[PDB]
């Protein structure tokens, strides 16, 4: 079974930065479409970013525009989320998900509809104090 | 005077073009049509086709000439990959899944199948092969599922370099036309190089 | 070239109120990070508060928290240290210094390390009965 | 029959004792030499190698005519602005790339080199200017900037010195540590394609 594993998180302070990583085991993230989604407590899950299949058109949500950067390395088969200038309301748990095809923004469809096939466990990111 | 032999049936062309579900691209279903009369009029009252290209023969001349050993094969592909089903093109489908020879005598028919070959939140029943050691020789089917190693380390099981070769087009109804499903039937036949078996409208 | 000039002081009583204010002339305090430090007589100098960049990430110490309210206005370019319910041991001379970048507690470094540029002159604040 | 010589001064650019600041980014020209793109890989555990319009492994078997190279160091959390099509403090006031840019962008860490105890106050960046910056321009001038209605003459409040020094200490986090950034700007123009790569 193809599994996706995350790494990162910690005790970052406001104004700091982190790099979240998501590494696969059976699929090439250069032929699938990857993304990030988050869960603050007491809320419903909302997307963060996406990369399409080839080359990669990066899409970003309105809350995190300009601050976060999504990128993929095809040698280690790992997608990276470089988060810059984290605010105190950004504390959540982050999930990485993958789907076959250039699934982000084809036609009247967009990745906020949370229906990706592959998914993972999640890593806690907190920022406070 | 024209003399053509005794015939019984009207060839199973309706039974191929209108089935419940077609085969995947890596394992395309191929059928043989022989010992009947092949009327190419039942194909016209089928759909407003997206691509009807014939090589070596005109579409309107198809009833009054005849031939032998016709092959019909069917599969379901992505929207932007329809132009790869042609002699002399390259791509993921045309190099690893389905190759036509340069000297091809036949026709290619494609139409839209979104209302049937698509379900909400994914339709993961249509697979294609993306990783293969080498290119595919014309008309060759590879149903082999084995871990593909893209790294120096020999692969024992799914790993950062070990990739399963079959990926699944995720047909979804809200996609744009270029990612929508399309059913492709390719007819192949030989003209006047063998004794004929099927010809069509008798007199 | 760049000067930090403090204001305030006087003869306050326990439980009284005060608003210390040091004004930046040269540098601008929305791109620089400032804070307050004090030195009691016969003791070594210890920090009071900080503000970081422009967001505001107020940082207090255990011996000084619960009575101080740091604040800043981007209009008059003057940082404010409002005094609420001060005690009798708070008599000391106060200094403010500002360092470029979000300097206070942005890693393994807090402002305890007094390595600070733009050092100010000072204002004597005493309390008695 | 010709033997390969003039291996280009890529080593003199990459391995230097110190680089220049962002507002005063030094730019060198590499021409009339053959460019071996193999000395770049055996340098460091690189942080970022991201570029558009040309493949990394395909750099050997094509040709250009005039490549440029520039070097500067930026705060860690702002490396992402060195790319076509983004905004920010660097991307609008200090260094802006064209929207149609061909060339490659390299970054790596320099915490052990460009930092010391009690702060390193010898690299600077510009914080205020009147308007935006056209691509490929250097603004050396150091003049006061008026942000309010009252004109400020000499020096005082509401008028600010436009140069601000990054404080570099080794105990900062990753986003506030120095990252040396080198950008190549491969071009092809009226002059014939001269600089190329070695072959067998």
Tokens 């080593």 -> residue:
D11
CB pairs under 8 A between A and B: 58
Structure tokens at D144: 């006061």
CATH number where B51 lies: 3.30.70.1840
- D interface mutation test: which of C26, C34, C79 has the most D CBs within 10 A? C26
Are the C-beta atoms of residues B40 and B63 closer than 8 Å to each other? yes
Nearest Cα to Cα of residue D73 among D141, D124, D38, D134: D124
Tokens 């950034």 -> residue:
D181
Nearest Cα to Cα of residue D169 among D180, D159, D161, D177: D177
Q: Is C107 on the interface with A (CB under 8 A)?
A: yes
3-class secondary structure for chain D? CCCCCCCCCHHHHHCCCCCCCCCCCEEEEECCCCCCCCCCCCCCCCCEEEEECCCCCCCCCCCCCCEEEEEEEECHHHHHHCCCCCCCHHHHHCCCCCCCCCEEEEEEECCCCCCCCCCCCCCEEECCCCCCCCCCCCCCCCCCEECCCCCCCCCECCEECCEEECCCCCCECHHHCCEEEEEECCCCCCCCCCCCCCCC
Per-position DSSP letters for A95-112, written without gaps between them: EEEEEESS-TT-SS--TT
Are the C-beta atoms of residues C37 and C49 closer than 8 Å to each other? no
Nearest Cα to Cα of residue A110 among B3, D193, B174, D41: B174
Cβ of D155: how many Cβ atoms within 10 Å?
14
Domain extent at residue D95: 1-200
Structure tokens at A88: 């105190």
Q: How far apart are CA C67 and CA D59, in angstroms?
A: 63
Measured in angstroms, the CA of C41 and the nearest CA of chain D are apart by: 26
- CB-hemisphere CA count at 13 Å for D27? 14
> Is there a domain that residue C121 lies in?
no
- The distance in angstroms from the start CA to the end CA of chain C is 40
Q: How far apart are CA C4 and CA B202, in angstroms?
A: 106
Alpha helix (H) residue ranges in chain B: 13-17, 92-96
Among D127, D165, D172, select the one facing C109 at the smallest CB separation: D172
H-helix or E-strand spanning residue B155: none
Cβ of C122: how many Cβ atoms within 10 Å?
18
Cβ-defined contact of D174 to A66 (cutoff 8 Å): no
Bridge partner list, C47: C37
Q: How far apart are CA B116 and CA B119, in angstroms?
A: 8
Q: How far apart are CA B16 and CA B74, in angstroms?
A: 8
Residue A54: helix, strand or coil by DSSP? coil
> Is there a domain that residue B7 lies in?
no
Cβ-defined contact of A13 to C53 (cutoff 8 Å): no
Tokens 């990753």 -> residue:
D174
Are the C-beta atoms of residues D47 and D109 closer than 8 Å to each other? yes
Cβ of D176: how many Cβ atoms within 10 Å?
24
Structure tokens at C84: 């609420």
Domain extent at residue A54: 5-121
Cβ of B102: how many Cβ atoms within 10 Å?
8
Closest Cα in chain D to A85:
D77
Share of chain A residues as helix, strand and coil, in percent rounded to the nearest 5: 0, 45, 55
Cβ-defined contact of D173 to C106 (cutoff 8 Å): yes
Bridge partner list, D175: none
Tokens 């600089």 -> residue:
D195
Q: How many domains does chain A have?
A: 1
Cβ-defined contact of B179 to A2 (cutoff 8 Å): no
Q: How far apart are CA C52 and CA C31, in angstroms?
A: 9
Per-position DSSP letters for C38-94, written without gaps between them: EE-TTS--EEEEE--TTT------TTTTTSEEEEEETTTTEEEEEEES--GGG-EEE
The angle formed by the CA atoms of residues B78, B80 and B81, to the nearest 5 degrees, is 65
Residue A90: helix, strand or coil by DSSP? helix
Is it the case that chain C and chain B have 3 or more CB pairs lying under 8 Å apart? no
> Is there a domain that residue B147 lies in?
no
DSSP conformation class of A27: S
Q: What Rg, from alpha-carbon coordinates, does chain D have? A: 19
Q: How far apart are CA B89 and CA B91, in angstroms?
A: 7
Sign of CA dihedral D173, D176, D182, D184: positive
- B interface mutation test: which of A106, A108, A114 has the most B CBs within 10 A? A106
DSSP conformation class of B79: G
Cβ of A49: how many Cβ atoms within 10 Å?
23
- Phi/psi at A19 (5° precision): -125, 105
Structure tokens at B196: 């004929």
Residue B141: helix, strand or coil by DSSP? coil
> Is there a domain that residue C66 lies in?
yes
Bridge partner list, A17: A84
Structure tokens at A18: 């982190």
Q: How many domains does chain B have?
A: 1
Q: How far apart are CA D129 and CA B19, in angstroms?
A: 69
CATH number where C87 lies: 2.60.40.10
Q: How far apart are CA C80 and CA C70, in angstroms?
A: 6
Counting beta carbons within 10 angstroms of the beta carbon of residue B48, is it exposed (0 to 12), middle (13 to 18) or buried (19 or more)? exposed
Q: How far apart are CA C124 and CA C93, in angstroms?
A: 4
Q: How far apart are CA A100 and CA B80, in angstroms?
A: 15
> Is there a domain that residue A126 lies in?
no
Resolution in A: 3.4
Bridge partner list, B33: B70
Pairing, β B166-168 against β D103-109: unpaired
- Experimental approach was cryo-EM
> Is there a domain that residue C120 lies in?
no
Are the C-beta atoms of residues A24 and A77 closer than 8 Å to each other? yes
- Cα–Cα distances in Å, from A118 out to A53, B57, B128, B165? 15, 47, 18, 16
Kindly give, in sequence order, each residue whose CB lies less than 8 Å from that of residue D198, ignoring residues fewer than 6 positions away.
D4, D34, D36, D60
Are the C-beta atoms of residues C126 and C98 closer than 8 Å to each other? no
Cβ-defined contact of A71 to D50 (cutoff 8 Å): yes
């Amino acid at each position: 079974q193809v599994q996706l594993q995350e790494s990162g998180g910690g005790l970052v302070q406001p104004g700091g930065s982190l790099r979240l990583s998501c590494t696969a085991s059976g699929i090439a993230l250069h032929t699938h479409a990857t993304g990030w989604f988050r869960q603050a407590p007491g809320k419903e899950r909302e997307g963060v970013s996406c990369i399409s299949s080839g080359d990669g058109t990066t899409y970003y949500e309105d809350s995190v525009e300009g601050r976060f950067t999504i990128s993929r390395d095809n040698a280690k088969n790992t997608v990276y989320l470089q988060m810059n200038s984290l605010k105190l309301e950004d504390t959540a748990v982050y999930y990485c998900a993958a789907d076959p095809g250039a699934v982000c923004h084809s036609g009247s469809y967009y990745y906020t509809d949370d229906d990706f096939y592959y998914r993972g466990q999640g890593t806690q990111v907190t920022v406070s104090s | 005077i024209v003399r053509f032999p005794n015939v019984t049936n009207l060839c199973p062309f309706h039974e191929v073009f209108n089935a419940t579900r077609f085969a995947s691209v890596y394992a395309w279903n191929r059928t043989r049509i022989s010992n009947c009369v092949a009327d190419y009029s039942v194909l016209y009252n089928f759909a407003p086709f997206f691509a009807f290209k014939c090589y070596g023969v005109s579409p309107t001349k198809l009833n009054d000439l005849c031939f032998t050993n016709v092959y019909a094969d069917s599969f379901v592909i992505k929207g932007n990959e329809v132009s790869q089903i042609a002699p002399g093109q390259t791509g993921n489908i045309a190099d690893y899944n389905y190759k036509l020879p340069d000297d091809f005598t036949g026709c290619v028919i494609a139409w839209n199948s979104n209302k049937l070959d698509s379900k909400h939140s994914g339709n993961y029943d249509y697979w294609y092969r993306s990783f293969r050691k080498s290119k595919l020789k014309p008309f060759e089917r590879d149903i082999s599922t084995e871990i593909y190693q893209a790294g120096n380390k020999p692969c024992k099981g799914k790993g950062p370099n070990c990739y399963f070769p079959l990926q699944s087009y995720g047909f979804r109804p809200t996609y744009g036309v270029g990612h929508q499903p399309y059913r492709v039937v390719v007819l192949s036949f030989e003209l006047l190089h063998a004794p004929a078996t099927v010809c069509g409208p008798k007199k």
